[PDB]
Design a protein around this motif. Sequence first.
Motif, PDB file in Angstrom:
ATOM      1  N   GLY A 148       0.778  -1.220   0.000  1.00  0.00           N
ATOM      2  CA  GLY A 148       0.000   0.000   0.000  1.00  0.00           C
ATOM      3  C   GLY A 148       0.811   1.272   0.000  1.00  0.00           C
ATOM      4  N   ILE A 149       2.098   1.200  -0.358  1.00  0.00           N
ATOM      5  CA  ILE A 149       2.975   2.361  -0.311  1.00  0.00           C
ATOM      6  C   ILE A 149       2.972   3.154  -1.611  1.00  0.00           C
ATOM      7  CG2 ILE A 149       4.412   1.331   1.480  1.00  0.00           C
ATOM      8  CD1 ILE A 149       6.499   0.695  -0.597  1.00  0.00           C
ATOM      9  N   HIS A 188      -0.371   0.926  10.433  1.00  0.00           N
ATOM     10  CA  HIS A 188       0.944   1.468  10.103  1.00  0.00           C
ATOM     11  C   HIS A 188       0.770   2.575   9.080  1.00  0.00           C
ATOM     12  CE1 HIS A 188       3.316  -1.292  12.433  1.00  0.00           C
ATOM     13  NE2 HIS A 188       2.587  -2.292  11.975  1.00  0.00           N
ATOM     14  N   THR A 189       1.227   3.775   9.424  1.00  0.00           N
ATOM     15  CA  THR A 189       1.159   4.932   8.539  1.00  0.00           C
ATOM     16  C   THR A 189       2.577   5.300   8.129  1.00  0.00           C
ATOM     17  OG1 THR A 189      -0.812   5.655   9.729  1.00  0.00           O
ATOM     18  CG2 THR A 189       0.242   7.239   8.252  1.00  0.00           C
ATOM     19  N   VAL A 190       2.855   5.194   6.833  1.00  0.00           N
ATOM     20  CA  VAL A 190       4.179   5.459   6.283  1.00  0.00           C
ATOM     21  C   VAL A 190       3.996   6.345   5.062  1.00  0.00           C
ATOM     22  CG1 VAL A 190       6.296   4.486   5.351  1.00  0.00           C
ATOM     23  CG2 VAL A 190       4.989   3.199   7.056  1.00  0.00           C
ATOM     24  N   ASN A 191       4.624   7.519   5.078  1.00  0.00           N
ATOM     25  CA  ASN A 191       4.552   8.447   3.948  1.00  0.00           C
ATOM     26  C   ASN A 191       3.101   8.803   3.627  1.00  0.00           C
ATOM     27  OD1 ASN A 191       5.610  10.108   1.875  1.00  0.00           O
ATOM     28  ND2 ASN A 191       5.332   8.459   0.372  1.00  0.00           N
ATOM     29  N   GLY A 192       2.293   8.949   4.677  1.00  0.00           N
ATOM     30  CA  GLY A 192       0.892   9.279   4.538  1.00  0.00           C
ATOM     31  C   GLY A 192      -0.013   8.134   4.141  1.00  0.00           C
ATOM     32  N   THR A 250       6.650   6.297  -2.343  1.00  0.00           N
ATOM     33  CA  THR A 250       7.351   5.934  -1.122  1.00  0.00           C
ATOM     34  C   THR A 250       8.760   5.452  -1.450  1.00  0.00           C
ATOM     35  OG1 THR A 250       5.272   5.397  -0.035  1.00  0.00           O
ATOM     36  CG2 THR A 250       7.271   4.482   0.930  1.00  0.00           C
ATOM     37  N   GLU A 251       9.740   6.007  -0.745  1.00  0.00           N
ATOM     38  CA  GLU A 251      11.153   5.758  -0.971  1.00  0.00           C
ATOM     39  C   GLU A 251      11.757   5.010   0.211  1.00  0.00           C
ATOM     40  OE1 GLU A 251      12.365   6.478  -3.852  1.00  0.00           O
ATOM     41  OE2 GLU A 251      10.600   7.603  -4.510  1.00  0.00           O
ATOM     42  N   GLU A 252      13.024   4.629   0.039  1.00  0.00           N
ATOM     43  CA  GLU A 252      13.721   3.869   1.068  1.00  0.00           C
ATOM     44  C   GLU A 252      13.741   4.614   2.397  1.00  0.00           C
ATOM     45  OE1 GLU A 252      17.421   2.199  -0.092  1.00  0.00           O
ATOM     46  OE2 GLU A 252      18.340   2.394   1.896  1.00  0.00           O
ATOM     47  N   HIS A 253      14.011   5.920   2.369  1.00  0.00           N
ATOM     48  CA  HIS A 253      14.153   6.652   3.622  1.00  0.00           C
ATOM     49  C   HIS A 253      12.836   6.745   4.388  1.00  0.00           C
ATOM     50  CE1 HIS A 253      12.763  10.093   1.166  1.00  0.00           C
ATOM     51  NE2 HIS A 253      12.373  10.609   2.317  1.00  0.00           N
ATOM     52  N   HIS A 254      11.697   6.778   3.683  1.00  0.00           N
ATOM     53  CA  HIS A 254      10.404   6.744   4.360  1.00  0.00           C
ATOM     54  C   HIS A 254      10.277   5.475   5.188  1.00  0.00           C
ATOM     55  CE1 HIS A 254       9.178   9.322   0.745  1.00  0.00           C
ATOM     56  NE2 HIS A 254       8.964  10.100   1.791  1.00  0.00           N
ATOM     57  N   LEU A 255      10.615   4.342   4.580  1.00  0.00           N
ATOM     58  CA  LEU A 255      10.505   3.067   5.279  1.00  0.00           C
ATOM     59  C   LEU A 255      11.535   2.956   6.391  1.00  0.00           C
ATOM     60  CD1 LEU A 255       9.997   0.915   2.115  1.00  0.00           C
ATOM     61  CD2 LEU A 255       8.284   1.357   3.866  1.00  0.00           C
ATOM     62  N   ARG A 256      12.771   3.403   6.141  1.00  0.00           N
ATOM     63  CA  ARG A 256      13.801   3.330   7.169  1.00  0.00           C
ATOM     64  C   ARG A 256      13.437   4.176   8.381  1.00  0.00           C
ATOM     65  NH1 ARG A 256      18.574   1.331   6.813  1.00  0.00           N
ATOM     66  NH2 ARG A 256      18.549   1.469   4.526  1.00  0.00           N
ATOM     67  N   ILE A 261       5.734  -5.342  15.075  1.00  0.00           N
ATOM     68  CA  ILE A 261       5.127  -4.655  13.945  1.00  0.00           C
ATOM     69  C   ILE A 261       3.776  -5.271  13.601  1.00  0.00           C
ATOM     70  CG2 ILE A 261       5.360  -4.387  11.463  1.00  0.00           C
ATOM     71  CD1 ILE A 261       8.431  -3.943  12.071  1.00  0.00           C
ATOM     72  N   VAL A 262       3.715  -6.600  13.503  1.00  0.00           N
ATOM     73  CA  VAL A 262       2.507  -7.223  12.961  1.00  0.00           C
ATOM     74  C   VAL A 262       1.339  -7.246  13.927  1.00  0.00           C
ATOM     75  CG1 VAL A 262       3.809  -8.503  11.225  1.00  0.00           C
ATOM     76  CG2 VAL A 262       3.189  -9.583  13.439  1.00  0.00           C
ATOM     77  N   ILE A 263       1.563  -6.973  15.213  1.00  0.00           N
ATOM     78  CA  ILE A 263       0.445  -6.900  16.143  1.00  0.00           C
ATOM     79  C   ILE A 263      -0.180  -5.519  16.208  1.00  0.00           C
ATOM     80  CG2 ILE A 263       1.188  -8.886  17.493  1.00  0.00           C
ATOM     81  CD1 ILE A 263       2.382  -7.180  19.477  1.00  0.00           C
TER      82      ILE A 263
END
Length: 166
Positions: A96-97, A153-157, A101-107, A147-149
Motif C-alpha cells: 500500500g505504499i 501502520h502509517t508510512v509516507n501518509g 514511497t522511498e527507502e528513507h520513508h521506510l527506514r 510490527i505485525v500486532i
Amino acid sequence: PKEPEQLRKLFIGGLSFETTDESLRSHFEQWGTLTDCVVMRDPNTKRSRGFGFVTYATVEEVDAAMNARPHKVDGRVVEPKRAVSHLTVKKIFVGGIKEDTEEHHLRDYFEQYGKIEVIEIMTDRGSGKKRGFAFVTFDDHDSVDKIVIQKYHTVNGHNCEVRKAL
Ligand SMILES: CC(=O)Nc1cccc(NC(N)=O)c1
C-alpha cells in the motif's frame, strides 16, 4: 485500561530443566512486574518440559525484557518470544505504499522497531516502475513481532498493510 493479556506474555523456550516458577520469576522480574510466571511440567513426572511463560503488567515491560536479550537463566541461554497472534521470521511485507514511497520513508519509520538490514522497494521487472510494496529485513524477529500486532501502520501518509514474509 490494561493492554490485553495476550500481548503482555512472553513464551520462554530452552529452559534449564532445573528452572522453577520461582527462579524464572526472580530472573524476569528484573524488567517489570510479573502477574504470572509458570514453568510447564509433565503432569505425571513433574519433570520440566523445558519451556514456560511469564506475563508482565505492561507491554513496555515486555519490550524491556526483549531488549535485554540474550537472557541466561539458571546457566542456560533461553529463547523468549511474544505470544502468537510461532512463525519466527525477520522479514516483513509492506503493502500500500504506492509509487511515491522511498527507502528513507521506510527506514525512518521501521528503524524504531528494530535494526534494519535490508530494504527492498519492489519494481516492475519490465518497466522499472514502483509496484507499491516493499520488504524490510531486520536483524531479529522481535521487531517483526511488534510490527505485525499493531492495528495500523502509517508510512509516507499511506495506511499500509504489513505482514510476516516467508
Ligand atoms: C534473533 C532472530 O530473530 N534470529 C533468527 C530468526 C529467524 C531465523 C534466523 N536464522 C538465521 N540464520 O539467522 C535467525
